[PDB]
Swiss-Prot record:
Any further remark recorded for this protein: Present with 12200 molecules/cell in log phase SD medium.
Domain Pru, chain residue ranges per copy: 1-126
Alphabetical keyword list: Acetylation, Cytoplasm, Nucleus, Phosphoprotein, Proteasome
Family: Belongs to the RPN13 family.
UniProt KW Phosphoprotein keyword: yes
Organism the protein comes from: Saccharomyces cerevisiae (strain ATCC 204508 / S288c)
The protein's name: 26S proteasome regulatory subunit RPN13
Subcellular location: Cytoplasm; Nucleus
Domain of life: Eukaryota
GO annotation (BP), single: proteasome-mediated ubiquitin-dependent protein catabolic process
Main location, first listed in the record: cytoplasm
Gene (UniProt): RPN13
Alphabetized GO MF terms: ubiquitin binding
Keyword Nucleus included in the entry's annotation: yes
């Protein structure tokens, strides 16, 4: 399975912005070796607690065509994961590493092309 490092970023999208407040965590991108619902679970874990928000651990199904991928929604901020979630909870993430994701802000999430390709592949799959 594919593991990636990020903490959370606020629930907020009432101005299409959420601010980084530093935190850590871990996402596990997996097909689910139980396949109960038959979708991708992003298992978030706190490794630092959310401060200035409370978002609990979550096993998060991405349901194609209900989950929309936008690669960046902030220009006063960098490294924002933007997933519009309908029929599910909304979790926005911010990469915990200030040394990486220094690639320019036009697609920035943690990288440009890699995250963009990867996130489109989850929509294409229903696995």
């Amino acid at each position: 399975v594919i593991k990636f490092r990020a903490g959370v970023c606020e629930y907020n999208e009432d101005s299409r912005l959420c601010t980084p407040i530093p935190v850590q965590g871990e996402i596990e991108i997996k097909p689910n070796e139980e396949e109960e619902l038959g979708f991708w679970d992003f298992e978030w874990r706190p490794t630092e607690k959310p401060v200035g928000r409370e978002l609990d651990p979550i096993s998060l199904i991405l349901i194609p065509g209900e989950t929309m991928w936008v690669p960046i929604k902030s220009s006063k901020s960098g490294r924002i994961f933007a997933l519009v979630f309908s029929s599910n909870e909304r979790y926005f993430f911010w990469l915990q590493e200030k040394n990486s994701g220094n690639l320019p802000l036009n697609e920035l999430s943690a990288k440009d092309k890699e995250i963009y390709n990867k996130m489109i592949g989850v929509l294409n799959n229903s696995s």
